Every structure is written in C-alpha cells, then in structure tokens.
Ligand binder design. Structure first.
Ligand SMILES: N=C(NCCC[C@H](N)C(=O)O)NP(=O)(O)O
Ligand SMILES: N=C(NCCC[C@H](N)C(=O)O)NP(=O)(O)O
Lengths: 344, 352
C-alpha cells in the first residue's frame, strides 16, 4: 500500500548520514519523440506512454493512474514526494510507476512525458543517480528521448533542459537553526549555485528545520558533476550540523536533554498544537533521538508527522475545512496517537 | 527519623473535607511560660531551661492516637533537616533559622508540632488534612490544656496570652488553611479576593507563610484577628470565608472549563508532559506544573495521577527534602536535575 504516510521500510533504512540527511532524490526529466503511433494529439501520446509502462512493468512496480486515485491518495503521494502536485491535479493522463518499496517513482505525463525519480534514505545521491540512470537506460531502449545534441535533453520547462537532472537532498539541521547558523550556510549554498528551501511551511520559514538542497546549475556540468557537487556541499553541511550538535551537547548537556524531552512531553500530551509548534517540537524530538537522549521513539516520527501535521494536509485528510483551533486539536490528537504507538 | 524521610505522613495523607482544594487546616496557639522572659528578651540560660522543661515533661510522652512526642532541638539539626521540617509544615521558618534555642515536640503521627522558643516559648500546632478547622481547634485546645497541666502560661485577663508578636496578641491563635486556588489565579479573580479577604480580618499568604510566595497556587488563608474574638469565632469566621473561597474556586473552575475547554485540558496536560519528561526543573516550575496537574486531575482531564502522589511531589520537590532524599547537600543545578528525575520516576511509577 503506497498511501501509507509512514516512512517506508526502504526510506527508514539507515543510509549514510541518514540522521541528518533524511533523503537523497534524483529526478530525470525526459520527453519522448517519434512515438510508435506518430500521433498529432497529446492525448494519444499520453495514452501510448501509459500503455508503454503498463505493458512493460506489469522487480515489482505498480502503475498508479491519477484518474484512479482519490484526492487524499494523490495528496499522500505528493507529500511523499512520489508525484508532483501537477501530476495529482493537472495531468489528465498522469500516472506514477511506483516500485513496491517506493524507492523508484516514474511520473508519466506531467510537465514532461517522463520524470524518473529515485529516492534514497540518507545521503545516497550517487546510488540514486545510478538507479535512476538504470531506469533511464531501460526506458530509452524502448522510446526516443527528445534530445538536441548541443542542448541536451529537451524538457517542457527549461529549468531542466540539458541533463534533465534535478538532484536534491532533504536535511534536518536543527542544530544549525538553533545556533542561528542557518542564514550563514544559505549564502554559501547559493554561491555554489545550489538552491536551498525549507520543505515545510510557507516561504522560507522551514518548519521542522527540514531543508531541501538541490541543484540549479544545468547546462555545463555532467550529471555526475552536478551530483558530486551537491554531495560535497551536503557533506560540508553535515559536518557543520554535527559540529553544531556536538558543541550543543558539550555546552548544554542535560539542558539539551531537557529541551528535547520537554518537546517530547508536549507532543506526547498536548491537546492543542499549531503546525509551527508541532514542527519545532518534532525537530527537537528528532534531534533528541539522533543524540540518543530519546531512545524509545523512531526517528521517522519527524518525517511522518511533519506531513500529517501540515494544516492543509490535516484538512485534506480530515475530509473537510477545519478552523485553526480545530486543526490544532486534531493535530495534537494525531501526534499524541503516533507517539502512543511508539510507547507500545 | 521518619520525620525527615516521609514527605506526607499517613495522618496528612487522609482525604479531608474539601481536600481537593483545601490541602490542610492548621491551628497554632502561641503561649509564653510564666517566670521566663519571652524569646525576644530571654537569656540563653532561660531558653535552655525552657527546652529542658518541655524535654522533661514531654519527651516520649504518649499522646494517645498521635503517638508519643519526640523532641527535635534546632541546635541538633542541620539546615537541610530543618528545611525539611519547614517544608513539611511541621515547623516555621522562624524556628528553623531564627531560634538558636528552638526545639519542637513532634507527635509521631506528625499531627502535632509544639514549637519551643519560636517567637514565643510555645507554639502549639495541630495540622489536619483538608478542611478540618473545628477538629484542629478542638485538637489544639485539648493539647493546650494538656500542656498547661505542665506549664503555666503567661496570661492577662485583659490582654490574653502575653506573646512576643503583635500578631499573636490575645488568643495567641493562628488558624490557617492551605488552599489550592489555581482557577482563581488563572481567572485573575484572586487579585480581587485577596484584598477583600484582608479587609475581613483574614490574610492571604504564600505556601510557607509570611514573606513566601504562593508556590503552585497554594495560598495560606489565616486569621489576622487574634484579640477580642473567641477562638471558636475566629476559626468559624475563617471557615466561613474558606467555604466561600472553595465555592469561588469551584465556580472559577467551571467558568474556565466552559470558556477555555480544550485549552484548559491542553494547559494541564502540557504541565503533565513537562513533569513526566523534563530533565531539569526547579522547585518553582515544578510547583506550577504540579498545580496544573492537580487541577487537571481535579477536573478529570488527567488520569492515573493520585492526589497522594501530587501531595508527595509537592514536598519531595522542595530543596531541603530533595537534599534529604538525595543523601546530602545539592547545589541548585544538581537539585533541578535530581528533582526532574524524582518527578519522572514517581509519575512513571504512578502510570506504570
Ligand atoms: N494557525 C493555527 N492556529 C492558530 C492559533 C493561533 C496561534 N498559532 C497560537 O497557537 O497561539 N493552526 P495551524 O493548523 O498551524 O494553521
Ligand atoms: N534555584 C533552583 N535553580 C536555579 C536555576 C538553575 C537551572 N535550572 C540550572 O540547571 O542551572 N532550583 P531549586 O532547587 O528550586 O532551588
């Protein structure tokens, strides 16, 4: 079942630096030319492409067609970064070829005909790129990619023209945020051409201290060079976060243990919590788990509950519009329950 | 021995009338002994003779159901031990800190504390759980007469018992109740009630009397009038105002439940969440959270936490008792870590 908001067995595996790096994501955007039926209609191209993947994937993959999913199922796929918002809503023949472990997602008929996604836990960009490239090679053996031998892969949005590659890592940087170093690392990332965004919240507030660092640097660099560059910056960010964490432990000791356990205590017991406080507390709890203060709570609580406690998702899940105070009560209840599952 | 290592005696652990709000009822009777100068004037020789008088008369003396009296001399106790007795409300800060020749006769059940060389030669204290002012006054008056069979009180027909303090003039009677008034505090009402009560000849003080703060919204309501009113009327008048206070607190709770609803449940559970999980907590925060949790158990929000454990924790988390329980002296930051751990384990054993 792909619509389990919990961290998959695949994404809960401990990849390199997976305490700080939640996940590594490789996306390869492709468009197809010279269709098997040279149709003039996008409708027909989109259906041939779906037929291709339904015929060619029955490793176990399920082809999820957006037209066949309830809106909450599509929202979960969106929140799992398995599909884009555009695939859920705006793609009449949108479909997602999902591997059973949800490592592999091939979005069909979005902006581009093909978006191959590999999502790995921890810092495994090279592994994700290799896995995405193996599917890329498989797909290209059966279709012709729109490709200009001097411009590279042709993608609908010129955001991707060239390699069609977007590489991203999601990182939890509570210590850099706590010690107010985060706005020091943003310029270093921007100078290198990478893009850093908060994953959760509205415009740059980065709830949960979860950051997405991705490339933008396109035409010049090889895919391996894009990924090596991102990997290298991520490893420096990891080192900075670990240094900040170790400084925090050495300075605060029991006061840091107290901070993360109080955040735990709020999450385990509060009856009213807004998404911002929940995010801060979840980040603290995750840090406390990472530091081994909190020993009986899965670190995946951060990944899962950051999704489930978002205001819009919470309403989407509840099936209706909820006032903020109603959201805060349901959010607290959801969080308490998920932490009660950990106590058992 | 057990005076220092049990936070709440079996005696004080009994549920009393209205004991959810009224934690305790106390009657103190101040007296001086004829032929001894009062503690503000006496010599060290007189002070020692006073202790010796009470020692000879009352050490190990049986007092019925209360067990026998034990004599604790302040000079023979350490400041932590004395702080423990203050924190258990068995002796006054004055006796613990300001009476070199102070002593206290404690009943084995810790209902009775006869302080010696406090502000007066004798401060007879009877402590009852819940709202039991009539029973405490009866107990104290009985004990007063019983003691007076062994000492003669300085007494003037006009001025009553001659005491050292203007605040004991006449009856020497201080009747007090300890009340948990979290709703009146939260509704801001307490701000109007305190001056209103002060104008009726009562006074509202903190948890450890004059000059102390209301730890955990625990207020001491006591008479201010000691002279020109019978002891029964002083206590009856206090009781009447305590009953009104209970009524106001209960109404304030119902008002809070209706106006805050889940936010009140959130308030108490967050305090519970702190207590169950914090690793560092000072006694003041602990008291505030314990107050919230007590309110939460009173309103039925919080299950599996007894008033008994909350009573124990209110005492165990005090600095002296913490150091007593620890085994020795603790700096503030050590206290806060041991306090958090004590609370966590008591709350976790409370929920198992
Ligand atoms: N915005 C809210 N709640 C509003 C409460 C006011 C303020 N945040 C407070 O809690 O004090 N919830 P959401 O689901 O995170 O949007
Ligand atoms: N006075 C204190 N603590 C002072 C603050 C120390 C701070 N929590 C810290 O960790 O240093 N505790 P007490 O036992 O209530 O007297």
């Amino acid at each position: 079942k792909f619509f389990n908001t919990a961290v998959s067995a695949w994404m809960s595996q401990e990849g390199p630096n997976s305490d700080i790096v939640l996940s590594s994501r490789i996306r390869l955007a492709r468009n197809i030319v010279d269709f098997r039926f040279p149709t003039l209609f996008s409708s027909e191209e989109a259906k041939q492409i779906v037929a291709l993947f339904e015929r060619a994937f029955v490793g176990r993959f399920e082809l999820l067609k957006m037209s066949e999913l309830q809106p909450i199922e599509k929202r979960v796929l969106v929140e799992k970064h398995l599909i884009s918002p555009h695939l859920a809503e705006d793609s009449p023949f949108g479909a997602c070829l999902l591997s059973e472990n949800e490592e592999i997602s091939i979005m069909i008929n979005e902006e581009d005909h093909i978006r191959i996604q590999c999502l790995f836990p921890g810092l495994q960009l090279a592994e994700a790129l290799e896995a995405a490239s193996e599917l890329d090679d498989w797909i290209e053996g059966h279709v012709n990619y729109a490709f200009d031998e001097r411009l590279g892969y042709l993608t609908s949005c010129p955001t991707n023209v060239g390699t069609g590659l977007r590489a991203s890592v999601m990182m939890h940087l509570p210590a850099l945020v706590l010690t107010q170093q985060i706005n020091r690392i943003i310029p270093a990332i921007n100078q290198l051409g990478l893009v850093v965004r908060g994953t959760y919240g509205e415009g740059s507030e980065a709830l949960g201290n979860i950051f997405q660092i991705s490339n933008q640097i396109t035409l010049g660099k090889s895919e391996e060079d894009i990924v090596a560059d991102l990997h290298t910056i991520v490893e420096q960010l990891i080192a900075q976060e670990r240094a900040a964490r170790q400084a925090l432990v050495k300075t605060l000791g029991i006061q840091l243990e107290d901070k993360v356990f109080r955040s735990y205590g709020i999450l385990a017991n509060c009856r009213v919590i807004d998404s911002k406080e929940a995010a801060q507390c979840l980040s603290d709890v995750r840090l406390g788990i990472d530091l081994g203060y909190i020993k009986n709570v899965s670190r995946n609580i951060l990944n899962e509950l950051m999704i489930l406690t978002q205001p819009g998702f919470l309403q989407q899940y509840a099936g209706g519009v909820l006032r903020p105070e109603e959201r805060d009560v349901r959010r607290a209840a959801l969080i308490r329950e998920r932490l009660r599952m950990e106590t058992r």
